[PDB]
Write a protein that binds this ligand. Structure first.
Ligand code: Y0A
Length: 119
């Protein structure tokens, strides 16, 4: 029932994600010079370095907020993909499945801890 345990759990999961080859395209913001129409399609850029920095700054209150930003990385890739068969989109779907498999217990444990706190 540790209300703070999510933060280190999220740091560890981000470490795993940075070790995954599938995260390569999502470790920094999209350079417009490679993809000059990116901001015509994507309203809110997001990447794993921005997520880690936000976490390490103490600017997430809950793992739900972190989860919303990570899911934005994946929705941006689905919105920007010219094909569902894209290399970089296919990497996003595998990384998304890995992230969802690992974040589920982090969320469950946090929400259980908060319910216990307010019991
Ligand atoms: C790590 C910094 C530079 C790598 N980032 C980058 O240029 N990417 C990632 C996001 N992109 C897509 O999700 C996508 C879908 C289909 C094609 O690209 C655009 C290309």
């Amino acid at each position: 029932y540790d209300i703070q345990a999510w933060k280190k759990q999220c740091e560890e999961l981000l470490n795993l994600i940075f070790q995954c080859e599938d995260s390569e395209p999502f470790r920094q913001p999209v350079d417009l010079l490679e993809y000059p129409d990116y901001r015509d399609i994507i309203d809110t850029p997001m990447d794993f370095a921005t997520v880690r920095e936000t976490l390490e700054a103490g600017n997430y209150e809950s793992p739900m907020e972190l989860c919303k930003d990570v899911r934005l990385i994946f929705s941006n890739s689905k919105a920007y993909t010219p094909s569902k068969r894209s290399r970089i989109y296919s990497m996003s779907l595998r990384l998304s499945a890995f992230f969802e498999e690992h974040i589920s217990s982090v969320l469950s444990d946090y929400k259980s801890a908060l319910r216990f706190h307010k019991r």
